[PDB]
Design a protein around this nucleic acid. Structure first.
Ligand SMILES: [Ca+2]
Ligand SMILES: [Ca+2]
Length: 326
DNA sequence: CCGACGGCGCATCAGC
DNA sequence: GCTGATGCGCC
DNA sequence: GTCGG
């Protein structure tokens, strides 16, 4: 990380714009800039040098010049000083509390972890579980634990129905030595774009994982997406593992490659790739890649038999998951 | 200058 | 109840 | 906040 100071600065600004200003485009701009700088293979010596990069404009150039000169940014110094900004930024670190709810809480005088813990009845379900495991969800997951988690999940769905396929995606699939959480893609042949030949396909898997005490809580749950909490079992006389966030996404079996491309990410890589696709006259979601018509209306799904086929359509050389960490 | 910025699942609420 | 908007979440 | 046109 040659430019960790700069990318941290920009990430902090992104978070401020999102959580406090509620300026989502500024949020995205700062994150794009942080990402392009993060992969830039030189120690940056000036804001002019940075402005050469796409997504870094005049305003970020000037900030970079300030940061390089002084080691800090006065704008961020003041934001860190501000009680209301500081409080809102903190509250959004709880899962389920976004920028709107955080500001509303701060209005009511709920602005610390302690305040939240005495006001649980003022939270919805997601928020209550996010608060319950606030400390644990701050922790990262070593790959060794991710491998244990993978082995449990893959073997338990195998027990429900051997025709399930579970694939761990996200940062794990990109080969990260540690992950923020666990993302699991699920398919079953009875769920395609053409038909659903069995009910409760996701529910049965969630229930089995609950049965063996792996899944411990649920943040939200529908027919194709589960958002919840899980925990590795621990051995005799040793401290319990931290509770971990887990997402499970059931995708039509014939749309696996669009699905695994989406769920492998990174999020910025996906934004970049989908933005690029548009410029080639295609639109990509987790299901399909479709041509855009003369009017900009999405056409019918294109044939896809591999991840590379999706890259092929938009004229990108294939990129392995490990090179998608943007 | 200015439109566009990736795409969507689940929970919640107002209006009906 | 539903539908559409909004909030928050995922990559 | 940034970029393409
Ligand atoms: Ca993840
Ligand atoms: Ca996740």
């Amino acid at each position: 990380t040659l430019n960790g100071g700069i990318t941290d600065m920009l990430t902090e600004l992104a978070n401020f714009e999102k959580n406090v200003s509620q300026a989502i485009h500024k949020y995205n701009a700062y994150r794009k800039a942080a990402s392009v700088i993060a992969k830039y293979p030189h120690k940056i010596k000036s804001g002019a040098e940075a402005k050469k990069l796409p997504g870094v404009g005049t305003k970020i150039a000037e900030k970079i010049d300030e940061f390089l000169a002084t080691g800090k940014l006065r704008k961020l110094e003041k934001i860190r000083q501000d009680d209301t900004s500081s409080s809102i930024n903190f509250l959004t670190r709880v899962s389920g509390i976004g920028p709107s709810a955080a500001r509303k809480f701060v209005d009511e005088g709920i602005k610390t972890l302690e305040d939240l813990r005495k006001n649980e009845d003022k939270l919805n379900h997601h928020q209550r579980i996010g608060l319950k495991y606030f400390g644990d969800f701050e922790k990262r997951i070593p790959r060794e634990e991710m491998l244990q988690m993978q082995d449990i999940v893959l073997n338990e769905v195998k027990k429900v129905d051997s025709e399930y396929i579970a694939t761990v995606c996200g940062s794990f699939r990109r080969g990260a030595e540690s992950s923020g959480d666990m993302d699991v893609l699920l398919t079953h042949p009875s769920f395609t774009s053409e038909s659903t030949k069995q009910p409760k396909l996701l529910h049965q898997v969630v229930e089995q994982l609950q049965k063996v005490h792996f899944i411990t809580d649920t943040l939200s749950k529908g027919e194709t997406k589960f958002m919840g909490v899980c925990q590795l079992p621990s051995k005799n006389d040793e401290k319990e593992y931290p509770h971990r966030r887990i997402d499970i996404r059931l995708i039509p079996k014939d749309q696996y490659y669009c699905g695994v491309l989406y769920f492998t990410g990174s999020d910025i890589f996906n934004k970049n790739m989908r933005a690029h696709a548009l410029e080639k006259g295609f639109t990509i979601n987790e299901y399909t890649i479709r041509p855009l018509g003369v009017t900009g209306v999405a056409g019918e799904p294109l044939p896809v038999d591999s991840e590379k086929d999706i890259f092929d359509y938009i004229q990108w050389k294939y990129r392995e998951p490990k090179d998608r960490s943007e």
